[PDB]
Nucleic acid binder design. Structure first.
Ligand SMILES: [Mg+2]
Ligand SMILES: [Mg+2]
Ligand SMILES: [Mg+2]
Ligand SMILES: [Mg+2]
Ligand SMILES: [Mg+2]
Ligand SMILES: [Mg+2]
Ligand SMILES: [Mg+2]
Ligand SMILES: [Mg+2]
Ligand SMILES: [Mg+2]
Ligand SMILES: [Mg+2]
Ligand SMILES: [Mg+2]
Ligand SMILES: [Mg+2]
Ligand SMILES: [Mg+2]
Ligand SMILES: [Mg+2]
Ligand SMILES: [Mg+2]
Ligand SMILES: [Mg+2]
Ligand SMILES: [Mg+2]
Ligand SMILES: [Mg+2]
Ligand SMILES: [Mg+2]
Ligand SMILES: [Mg+2]
Ligand SMILES: [Mg+2]
Ligand SMILES: [Mg+2]
Ligand SMILES: [Mg+2]
Ligand SMILES: [Mg+2]
Ligand SMILES: [Mg+2]
Ligand SMILES: [Mg+2]
Ligand SMILES: [Mg+2]
Ligand SMILES: [Mg+2]
Ligand SMILES: [Mg+2]
Ligand SMILES: [Mg+2]
Ligand SMILES: [Mg+2]
Ligand SMILES: [Mg+2]
Ligand SMILES: [Mg+2]
Ligand SMILES: [Mg+2]
Ligand SMILES: [Mg+2]
Ligand SMILES: [Mg+2]
Ligand SMILES: [Mg+2]
Ligand SMILES: [Mg+2]
Ligand SMILES: [Mg+2]
Ligand SMILES: [Mg+2]
Ligand SMILES: [Mg+2]
Ligand SMILES: [Mg+2]
Ligand SMILES: [Zn+2]
Lengths: 138, 229, 53, 208, 148
RNA sequence: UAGCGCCGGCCAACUCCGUGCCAGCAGCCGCGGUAAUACGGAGGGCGCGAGCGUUACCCGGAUUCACUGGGCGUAAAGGGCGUGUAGGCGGCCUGGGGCGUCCCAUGUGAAAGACCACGGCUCAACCGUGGGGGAGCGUGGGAUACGCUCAGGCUAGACG
RNA sequence: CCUGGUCCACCCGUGACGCUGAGGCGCGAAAGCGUGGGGAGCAAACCGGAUUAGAUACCCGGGUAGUCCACGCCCUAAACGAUGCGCGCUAGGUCUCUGGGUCUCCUGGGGGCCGAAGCUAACGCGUUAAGCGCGCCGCCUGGGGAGUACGGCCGCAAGGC
C-alpha cells in the first residue's frame, strides 16, 4: 500500500543514516537496484546486495558515514546529508537535455531515468539526453 | 594485561536499565540481567590502554573522577598512588570551563596552608582561626586531590560515565579526551576511551583502577608493588 | 505537561489520604482530571492496607 | 548643468583630499591642510557613528564628486557597466576614465577636470581628425588626442604644457610633449588608477 | 588586528518592585577577511561592558570558511528558528548583496561576491546564528570526495 | 538663468528664536503642555539640478495566493462521524505497442523592438548593417528506463 | 431473541480485486417542534421568602413546559485529542486491557505514562508523532463589521446551510 516505493526507499535510507545504521532493508525492485547502482558507484554508500526475508527479496544497503568528532556531539557527518524526491507520483517532473540542473554547484548529484537508462546530471550531458528527474542527493 | 582474569568478578552489570547504544557491547542476559561481553572489553581495553601509555610517556596529567560510594575512596588510593589529581566529593560545576575562578579558591586554601604554621594567627580572636580551619577543613574536603592540577588535563578518568555526566560534559566540551568505565548503566559515543565493565562492585573497579595506574606508573618509569584494597 | 504536577500533587494527596486507618473515601477536588488521581490515588493506598496487613 | 560652485568646500566634507582645484590644492592652501573638518558650523562638533547607508553614499559621492559629472550620466555609466561583460568596478572606472574631458586632464593639458572640460568644450582640443567639443566622448583605445592647429600656441594652454614638460603619465598613456599630440593606448586596468575610493561601496550602494 | 563590527545594540528590561531595571546587550561579528569568522552575543548591565563581552565570546566562537575565488563553494539554504537565510555564490563583479546583518558577517568573513536572501523571520539575533550555522555548513570539492 | 525637495527615527543632513494640545505637521510610529533637532521663520547642512517635488495608477519589496516558494494542537485554518459517485493516485516479474516522455533532422516562429558586436549623426539619445537566439506547433527518423495501454505469470497490499 | 463491528490463530482459497473521495446518501449530544401517550423526582418561565443601595440573580419554600415512551421533524456544539484518512520507515523504559504461544518471557491488537533521534515560536510532540516520506480530500490568507445582509436552498416554526 505504498504509493511511491522509490521515495519510500530514499526516505528509508534517510531515516537510518540519521541514527547511523550499519545497513537497512528496502523491498527489492529492478528499478530500485538500478538506482542504488548510482548512489554506491558515486560513493554515497558502500553498496547493496540481494538478501532474503520470508522469501521476500529486499536490498540491504550499507551506509557510508564519516569520521568521528571531538568537542561536544561526536556524531559523524553523513555522506548523504540531503536526499529528496523530485518527480513525485503527484507531479511527474520532466526535463530535456538543455533544462538539466546542477546539484549544489557540481558538488551533489541529480539521478534521472532516461531511455538510455538511469544516469546522472553529468551523464546526461555526456550522453546528451533528458528524462524524468528522479531525485537530488548530497 | 590479565586476560580472562577479568572474569573474577569484573563482568556484566544491570537489568533493563540499559541505554540501547551499549548493545554492541552486550553478550546476553541471564538472571533476567544484562551482561557484558568480555572479549569486547579486551579488544577495546587493548586499544584503550595505548592512549594512556602514550600520554604518560608524553608526560602529562589525567583527571580521575568518581563520587559513587562503591568506587569512592578506591579512587583516592590509586590516585595519590599514581601521583595524579582526583575528585572524591561533590563535583564542582565549571571545574574545567570555569577553572580560572575555581583556581582563585585553590590558591585560597594554600593561603591557609602558609597560615597553618604562621606567626600571623594567635593574634586572632579564636573563631577567626576556626572560621579559617572550617574553611580549611572545607577547602580540604572538596579539593584535596585538586591542587595537583594547575593547567588543563590532556584526558580524564571517570568511574560512572552517566553519573558524572556533568563532568563528562565540560571535558567532552573543551576537546579534552574522556576515558572511563561504562556499562549497562550508560552509553558509548559520549566517551572516546571506554571500559566496558561494571561501574559498581569494587572488584570490577579495583582491577581497572590499579592495573591501569600500574601500566601508567610503569610507562612513566619504575615498577612497584600492587596497591591497597 | 507542567500540569502533571497538579495530578502529581492530587494523586499524592490521595495516596497519603488513603493510607490512614481510617481515611475518608469521600474527600476530593471538584475538578474532573484532578479527581481521577485523588480517588484512584486513595485506591492504591486503600488497596495496600489490604496487601501486607 | 555640471556642479559649478564652491569646490574646495566639498574638498572638506569628504574629509579626504580633493585636487579638483589643481595647483592650489598642491600648495598648503587646500584647506585639507587648513580645516580638515567638513563645512557648516557642525564640522567642529564630535563626529557620530556613520550608518552603513551613509558609508556607501559618501564613497559613491566622493568618486562621483571627482569627475564633476551628473548623477544621471554617472548612472548610465554604471548599468551598461554591469550590463557589459567582465568585472563591473573595473569597466565602470575604465569607461569612467575614457571620458574625454578626464582624458584631457589625464594627458595633462590642464590642472583641473573643470578646466579640462572648458578646454574641450571650447573645441580647443581634437581627435584623430576633426575638432570635438563634447566632454562626454568615449576615447577608444589607440586613438590620438591632439590640440588645435589653430589653438596651437596659446597663453593658458602653454604654461600648462610647461608643468607637463618631461613628467611621466599613465601605463595606458603616451605623450609627445611640446609636439602637442598624445595617445590613449591601453584600456586602463584597475591597478594603475589609484583613487581613495573603494569600488565596492559603489556597486553596493546601487542595490539601494 | 581582528576587524570586529557591531550590529545589534538593545536595551531590554525586567520589572522589580516599584521601578524597573535594565540590561543592555549586543551582537558582534569578528574577522580578518582571510576566512576566520565568529560572532557572539554580549549582554551586561552597562553599555560598553556588553560590547566588551560581545567581542570576547565572538573571539572564541569561530569557523572554517572555504572562500573559493573570494566568493563561496556552493549555494545553501538554512533554517534556524523560523528564520531563513540563503547564500548563492556570486561571480567576481557582484559585490556583497545582503541586509546589514548577513553582510557585516560576510564582510569580516571577507566574502567579496555574494547573492543572499532573507526569508522567514528577519529578527536579527536569529538571522545571526542562521548565517553562522550556514557558513559552518559549507563544503569544498575536497571535503566531498574524501567522505566518498 | 537657478531652482525644488528634505534635515525626529526608517533616512543623508543641527542650532537659535517664535509658538505652548493653539497655530500646525503627518507614509507608518507619532509631534505641539514654556527650554519642540518633528509646527512657523531664520542661520546652517544634506540631496538633486532646468528641473525639483506632489497626487493617480502598474510591478517590486509581498515569501502577504507560496509551481519555483506558505501554511492549519493552542496564532486565521481538519469537514460533527460515516458510506460512497466522479475524479486524482497505483505492489513484484516478463514481453508486444510507443501515447506521454527523451534526442536528431527539417518547416514555421514576418519586420521593428530586445541582446552581442561593428558602424553613420562631433558623442549621446537616435538611426544602420551583421550576428545568434527562443520556448511553441507541423513533418520525417530514433531511443524504452519512468508514467500509459494491451498480453502473460506472482504473493508481500487487500479480501475470503 | 434479532444484529454490527473488531481481535487472535492456521497459511487453506482469490490474485492488486487497492488508497482517497467534489457532489450524493445515512447517522448525528442537549435544547427545541408536530401528533398521541406518561408524569414520581427534578426543573427554564412563573409566584413567594430573604440578601441587597436595588437584586428582574447567587440562597430558601413553591411551580409549568420540558425531562420519559412511540412516531415524525430539527442538524447545531468547547460535535475537542480544538490533531482528516491510508501505507512505509525511524531508541527504549514503564502498567493496563484483551488474544496466542516451547508461559520468567516471547509475541498480535487496544489503552495511558517518561522519554532517542528528530520537530516546534515557545509550550510541548514523540511507533497512539505535532518525526521522516508518499497519495488524496478538506479548510486558512489582518481585527471589527459578521457568521450579519442580499440572493438561493432547506425547515411547521425556531432556525440551518
Ligand atoms: Mg539634462
Ligand atoms: Mg558585469
Ligand atoms: Mg518552520
Ligand atoms: Mg541622522
Ligand atoms: Mg513642513
Ligand atoms: Mg524645523
Ligand atoms: Mg508574488
Ligand atoms: Mg506549494
Ligand atoms: Mg504563513
Ligand atoms: Mg487555530
Ligand atoms: Mg475532527
Ligand atoms: Mg468525512
Ligand atoms: Mg471510505
Ligand atoms: Mg464505480
Ligand atoms: Mg473509484
Ligand atoms: Mg507502477
Ligand atoms: Mg489509474
Ligand atoms: Mg525577430
Ligand atoms: Mg534570452
Ligand atoms: Mg497461483
Ligand atoms: Mg456479536
Ligand atoms: Mg499458497
Ligand atoms: Mg438530534
Ligand atoms: Mg431531546
Ligand atoms: Mg414533545
Ligand atoms: Mg423572586
Ligand atoms: Mg428553587
Ligand atoms: Mg422544588
Ligand atoms: Mg414553546
Ligand atoms: Mg476535550
Ligand atoms: Mg478517536
Ligand atoms: Mg471547528
Ligand atoms: Mg475526511
Ligand atoms: Mg495534513
Ligand atoms: Mg494465554
Ligand atoms: Mg501496542
Ligand atoms: Mg477504540
Ligand atoms: Mg510524554
Ligand atoms: Mg505544528
Ligand atoms: Mg472565510
Ligand atoms: Mg448559527
Ligand atoms: Mg435570506
Ligand atoms: Zn581645497
Amino acid at each position: 500500500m505504498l504509493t511511491d516505493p522509490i521515495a519510500d526507499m530514499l526516505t528509508r535510507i534517510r531515516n537510518a543514516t540519521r541514527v547511523y545504521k550499519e545497513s537497512t532493508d528496502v523491498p527489492a525492485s529492478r528499478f530500485k537496484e538500478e538506482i542504488l547502482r548510482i548512489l554506491a558507484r558515486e560513493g554515497f554508500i558502500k553498496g547493496y546486495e540481494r538478501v532474503d526475508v520470508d522469501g521476500k527479496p529486499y536490498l540491504r544497503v550499507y551506509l557510508k558515514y564519516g569520521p568521528r568528532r571531538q568537542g561536544p556531539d561526536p556524531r559523524p557527518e553523513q555522506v548523504i546529508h540531503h536526499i529528496r524526491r523530485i518527480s513525485k507520483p503527484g507531479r511527474r517532473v520532466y526535463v530535456g537535455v538543455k533544462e538539466i540542473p546542477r546539484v549544489r554547484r557540481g558538488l551533489g548529484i541529480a539521478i534521472l531515468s532516461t531511455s538510455k537508462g538511469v544516469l546522472t546530471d553529468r551523464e546526461a550531458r555526456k550522453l546528451g539526453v533528458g528524462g524524468e528527474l528522479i531525485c537530488e542527493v548530497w | 594485561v590479565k586476560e580472562l582474569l577479568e572474569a573474577g568478578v569484573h563482568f556484566g552489570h544491570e537489568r533493563k536499565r540499559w541505554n540501547p547504544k551499549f548493545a554492541r557491547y552486550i553478550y546476553a542476559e541471564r538472571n533476567g540481567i544484562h551482561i557484558i561481553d568480555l572479549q569486547k572489553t579486551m579488544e577495546e581495553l587493548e586499544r584503550t590502554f595505548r592512549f594512556i601509555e602514550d600520554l604518560a610517556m608524553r608526560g602529562g596529567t589525567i583527571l580521575f573522577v568518581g563520587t559513587k560510594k562503591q568506587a569512592q575512596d578506591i579512587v583516592r588510593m590509586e590516585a595519590e598512588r599514581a601521583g595524579m589529581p582526583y575528585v572524591n566529593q561533590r563535583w564542582l560545576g565549571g571545574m574545567l570551563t570555569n577553572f580560572k575562578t575555581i583556581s582563585q579558591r585553590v590558591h585560597r586554601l594554600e593561603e591557609l596552608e602558609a597560615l597553618f604554621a604562621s606567626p600571623e594567627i594567635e593574634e586572632r580572636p579564636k573563631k577567626e582561626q576556626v572560621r579559617l580551619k572550617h574553611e580549611l577543613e572545607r577547602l580540604q574536603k572538596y579539593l584535596s586531590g585538586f591542587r595537583l592540577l594547575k593547567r588543563l588535563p590532556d584526558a580524564i578518568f571517570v568511574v560512572d560515565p552517566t553519573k558524572e555526566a556533568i563532568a563528562v560534559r565540560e571535558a567532552r566540551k573543551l576537546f579534552i579526551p574522556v576515558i572511563a568505565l561504562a556499562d549497562t548503566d550508560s552509553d558509548p559515543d559520549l566517551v572516546d576511551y571506554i571500559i566496558p565493565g561494571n561501574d559498581d562492585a569494587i572488584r570490577s573497579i579495583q582491577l581497572i583502577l590499579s592495573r591501569a595506574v600500574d601500566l601508567i606508573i610503569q610507562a612513566r618509569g619504575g615498577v612497584v608493588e600492587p596497591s591497597p584494597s | 505537561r507542567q500540569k502533571r504536577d497538579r495530578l502529581e500533587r492530587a494523586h499524592q494527596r490521595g495516596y497519603q489520604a488513603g493510607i490512614a486507618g481510617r481515611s475518608k473515601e469521600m474527600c476530593p477536588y471538584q475538578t474532573l482530571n484532578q479527581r481521577s488521581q485523588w480517588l484512584g490515588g486513595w485506591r492504591e493506598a486503600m488497596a495496600d492496607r489490604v496487601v501486607m496487613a | 548643468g555640471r556642479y559649478i560652485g564652491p569646490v574646495c568646500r566639498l574638498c572638506r566634507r569628504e574629509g579626504v583630499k580633493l585636487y579638483l582645484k589643481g595647483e592650489r590644492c598642491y600648495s598648503p592652501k587646500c584647506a585639507m591642510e587648513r580645516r580638515p573638518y567638513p563645512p557648516g558650523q557642525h564640522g567642529q562638533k564630535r563626529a557620530r557613528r556613520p550608518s552603513d547607508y551613509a558609508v556607501r553614499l559618501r564613497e559613491k559621492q566622493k568618486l562621483r564628486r571627482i569627475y564633476g559629472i551628473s548623477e544621471r550620466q554617472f548612472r548610465n555609466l554604471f548599468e551598461e557597466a554591469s550590463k557589459k561583460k567582465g568585472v563591473t568596478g573595473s569597466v565602470f572606472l575604465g569607461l569612467l576614465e575614457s571620458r574625454l574631458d578626464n582624458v584631457v586632464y589625464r594627458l595633462g593639458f590642464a590642472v583641473s577636470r573643470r578646466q579640462a572640460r572648458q578646454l574641450v568644450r571650447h573645441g580647443h582640443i581634437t581627435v584623430n581628425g576633426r575638432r570635438v567639443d563634447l566632454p562626454s566622448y568615449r576615447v577608444r583605445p589607440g586613438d590620438e588626442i591632439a590640440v588645435a592647429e589653430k589653438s596651437r600656441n596659446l597663453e593658458l594652454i602653454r604654461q600648462n604644457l610647461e608643468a607637463m614638460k618631461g613628467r611621466k603619465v599613465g601605463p595606458w598613456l603616451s605623450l609627445d610633449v611640446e609636439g602637442m599630440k598624445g595617445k590613449f593606448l591601453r584600456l586602463p586596468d584597475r591597478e594603475d588608477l589609484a583613487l581613495p575610493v573603494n569600488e565596492q561601496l559603489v556597486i553596493e550602494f546601487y542595490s539601494r | 588586528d581582528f576587524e570586529e563590527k557591531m550590529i545589534l545594540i538593545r536595551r531590554t528590561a525586567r520589572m522589580q518592585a516599584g521601578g524597573r531595571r535594565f540590561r543592555f546587550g549586543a551582537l558582534v561579528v569578528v574577522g580578518d577577511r582571510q576566512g576566520r569568522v565568529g560572532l557572539g552575543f554580549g549582554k551586561a548591565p552597562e553599555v560598553p561592558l556588553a560590547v566588551q563581552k560581545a567581542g570576547y565570546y565572538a573571539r572564541r566562537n569561530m569557523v572554517e570558511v572555504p572562500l573559493q575565488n573570494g566568493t563561496i563553494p556552493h549555494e545553501i539554504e538554512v533554517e534556524f528558528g523560523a528564520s531563513k537565510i540563503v547564500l548563492k555564490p556570486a561571480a567576481p563583479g557582484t559585490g556583497v548583496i545582503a541586509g546589514a546583518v548577513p553582510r557585516a558577517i560576510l564582510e569580516l568573513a571577507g566574502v567579496t561576491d555574494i547573492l543572499t536572501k532573507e526569508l522567514g523571520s528577519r529578527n536579527p539575533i536569529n538571522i545571526a546564528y542562521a548565517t553562522m550555522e550556514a557558513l559552518r555548513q559549507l563544503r569544498t570539492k575536497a571535503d566531498v570526495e574524501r567522505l566518498r
